[PDB]
Amino acid sequence: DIQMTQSPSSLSASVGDTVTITCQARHAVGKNLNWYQQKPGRGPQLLIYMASSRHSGVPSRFRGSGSGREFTLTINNLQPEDFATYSCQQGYTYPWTFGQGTKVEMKGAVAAPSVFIFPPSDEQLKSGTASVVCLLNNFYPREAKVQWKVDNALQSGNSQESVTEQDSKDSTYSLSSTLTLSKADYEKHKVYACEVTHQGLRSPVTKSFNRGEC
């Protein structure tokens, strides 16, 4: 099929800014190019068709341009409701392939995470499993890394993490990581550590506990 590539995959902007999203087709498609908008929990809706035509009801701040293999969506005077994901799509030959989407996010100031580590609860340990949780709170930008260690052993393959959507007011993200171990293994070890790397820190920070401490 015709490969579609958008640039960038995500960008940060402020209300009132002009934002430009690029879309490239590996083969030429004339003016047969659409743009769609999506939000979390909301499916796609048409913004632009035939490269530059606005769909009914779309504000004039949205502008499509380009042809052949190179296209752009310009959003002037970016509004709060415009923080969203934008996808291009060629409508020249089926399958009418989509680009990967570009997420328009809010700009924020660099902020290091506040890090908290939570031991398994006594309540959970009554059963055969232990979950250790590390919270990276209110940081910017989104990229961050967690490393888990138990008695200095690197834990690889037994953690999972997820990240919130950006905070409406402060532009920040938070991340939760859970290390899973058996109760028998948790009770056999002492030192639990979450090491965090993030742009807002000059070098890594580590939060840790000794099993059983108050």
Binding site: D1, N32, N34, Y36, G43, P44, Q45, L46, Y49, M50, S53, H55, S56, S87, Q89, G91, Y94, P95, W96, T97, F98, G99, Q100, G101, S114, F116, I117, F118, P119, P120, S121, E123, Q124, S127, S131, V133, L135, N137, N138, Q160, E161, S162, V163, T164, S174, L175, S176, T178, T180, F209, E213, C214
Partner: protein, 223 residues
């Protein structure tokens, strides 16, 4: 006033056939390409296939490996069958109309979409969560939370103090464990001064099992 909406099971077991219906209301199945499209989590939107009119020509994306059938079984419905599903087929499925006519908005685009339906491919069974308290060892700000573990299907919602506590709350996307069950955390940061001026309860709701749990979380102390 032409509206589309998808219906059918939200859960399909691996190797089984996923079936969905799109109901066109206001209008009916007419001279357009009636399409199915999907978006797997973390992947681009993907065309699945279409049919023209009532029983006209079809076209299917080769990416679906010849597992697709699309038919127009009533004047107002068209359907998708997707055979031999795997986890790669978990996605939000949309029906959509491709506009054919140069005298209307949306020419050569998906101008009208359904709202989408999430179909998850899983062998798991409905199970309500266990809820555990999150308290770190005893800077001015404290963190507390709840771990909502071992439930299926999604979703679970969490509030704090029956909705009276909203500032500082973060409820994370769930993760899927290899057991086939989800786990999720919800945390809140609060003034450390408040750890003795306030009780903290997370209110967990798992509607698929009609399970509600109100879990009191108490801070740790070295006293």
């Amino acid at each position: 006033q032409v509206q589309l909406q998808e219906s059918g099971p939200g859960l399909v077991k691996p190797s089984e056939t996923l079936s969905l219906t799109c109901t066109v209301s206001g209008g009916s199945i007419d001279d357009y390409f009636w399409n199915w499209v999907r978006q797997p989590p973390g992947k681009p939107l993907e065309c699945i296939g279409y049919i023209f009119g009532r029983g006209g020509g079809t076209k299917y994306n080769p990416s679906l490996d010849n597992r697709v059938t699309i038919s127009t079984d009533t004047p107002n419905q068209f359907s998708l069958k997707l055979r031999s599903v795997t986890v790669a087929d978990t996605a939000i499925y949309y029906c959509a109309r491709w506009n054919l006519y140069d005298d209307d908005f949306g020419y050569n685009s998906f101008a009208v979409w359904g709202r989408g339906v999430l179909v998850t491919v899983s062998s798991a069974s409905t199970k309500g969560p266990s809820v555990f308290p999150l308290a770190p060892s005893s800077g001015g700000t404290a963190a507390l939370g709840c771990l909502v573990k071992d439930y299926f299907p999604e979703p679970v919602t969490v509030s704090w103090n029956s909705g009276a506590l909203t500032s500082g709350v973060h409820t994370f996307p769930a993760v899927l464990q290899s057991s086939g069950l989800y786990s999720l955390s919800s945390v809140v940061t609060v003034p450390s001064s408040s750890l003795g001026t306030q009780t903290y309860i997370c209110n967990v709701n798992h509607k698929p099992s009609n399970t509600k749990v109100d879990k009191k979380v108490e801070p740790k102390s070295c006293d």
